[PDB]
Design a protein around this ligand. Structure first.
Ligand SMILES: Nc1nc2c(ncn2[C@@H]2O[C@H](COP(=O)(O)OP(=O)(O)O)[C@@H](O)[C@H]2O)c(=O)[nH]1
Ligand SMILES: [Ca+2]
Length: 305
């Protein structure tokens, strides 16, 4: 049974971890890493690492990414110890600030050195935060790409596409944080359930290892055209920098009840193949859950851009 860990680095990362913990998420372990002692005390993560106390006196990094970087480096052994034993690590962080920008790539590097398949899920700042934030974030994204196996990037400007004038900011943030949660959950479930055409952690590793950009999606539907609709939802990317277009490898799992037809499994696969507009090398799986009635769930992980 593969050991999955989700590590929040800095404020936005720790917000994403707290959102997942709010949901439940069993067989996933959470680590909270921050310079900011105030926030870190309000984490509900069972493992907390305060970094950079020597540098900051318990405060944040004040928007300087070199302080985040040095803070993580100076706590390398404590970070190693909290990671030790993980088969897979998700590092989540907001790019643009001092702690996430600087520390998240160090954390990712440590994870990969420890032997973990390492996935980054990070945000880019809103345009209203300005040019310097955007430039610092881009340097962070580049540093994350170098350090991780695969990287999912969520530009915060995309949240402006999914709100009306009244949508609470916290509701919008929860949509961004669902990218991480549903991805991690999708992988936990994939590993836990024995499929008729079974996928396992080694298939996740083949798709996610030393790649670059990634997409991780889930789609649920029922009734007429359920398979096409579930697959379309799984690959949709309103919040993602990296869409399905250009994907060269995909892990796709379909879960349905006993009604799950061969024809609709091919319909779903073809949606992904056609949307990619490449010769996709697909790792295909299927689960029959006889407790389902008319529901289908399609899980996609896409890489090789
Ligand atoms: N979507 C989202 N973005 C956030 C959140 N918190 C912070 N950010 C973004 O992440 C960037 C860095 O903020 P933060 O993580 O608090 O900085 P750090 O802790 O000092 O590294 C900000 O400039 C925002 O663009 C959050 O909860 N959700
Ligand atoms: Ca399985």
């Amino acid at each position: 049974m593969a050991t999955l860990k989700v590590i929040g680095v800095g404020g936005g990362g720790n917000n994403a971890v707290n959102a997942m913990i709010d949901h439940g998420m069993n067989n996933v372990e959470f680590i909270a890493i921050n310079t900011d002692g105030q926030a870190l005390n309000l984490s509900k993560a069972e493992s907390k690492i305060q970094i950079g106390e020597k540098l900051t006196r318990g405060l944040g990094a004040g928007a300087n990414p070199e302080i985040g970087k040095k803070a993580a480096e100076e706590s390398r052994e404590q970070i190693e110890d909290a990671i030790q034993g993980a088969d897979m690590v998700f590092v989540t962080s907001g790019m643009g600030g001092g702690t996430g920008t600087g520390a998240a790539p160090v954390v990712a590097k440590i994870a990969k050195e420890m032997g973990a398949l390492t996935v980054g899920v990070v945000t880019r700042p809103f345009s209203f935060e300005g040019r310097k934030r955007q430039t610092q974030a881009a340097a962070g994204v580049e540093a994350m790409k170098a350090a991780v196996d695969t990287l999912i990037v969520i530009p915060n400007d995309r949240l402006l596409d999914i709100v009306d004038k009244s949508t609470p900011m916290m509701e919008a943030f929860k949509e961004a944080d669902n990218v991480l949660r549903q991805g991690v959950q999708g992988i936990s479930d994939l590993i836990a359930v024995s499929g008729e055409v079974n996928l396992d952690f080694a298939d996740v590793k083949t798709i996610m290892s030393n790649q670059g950009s990634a997409l991780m999606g889930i789609g649920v539907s029922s009734g007429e055209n359920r398979a096409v609709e579930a697959a379309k939802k799984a690959i949709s990317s309103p919040l993602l920098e990296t869409s399905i277009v250009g994907a060269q490898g995909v892990l796709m799992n379909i879960t349905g009840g006993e009604s799950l037809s061969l024809f609709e499994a091919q319909e779903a696969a073809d949606i992904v193949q056609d949307a990619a507009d490449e010769d996709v090398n697909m790792i295909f799986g299927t689960v029959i859950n006889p407790e389902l009635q008319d529901e289908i769930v399609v899980t996609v992980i896409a890489t090789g851009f």
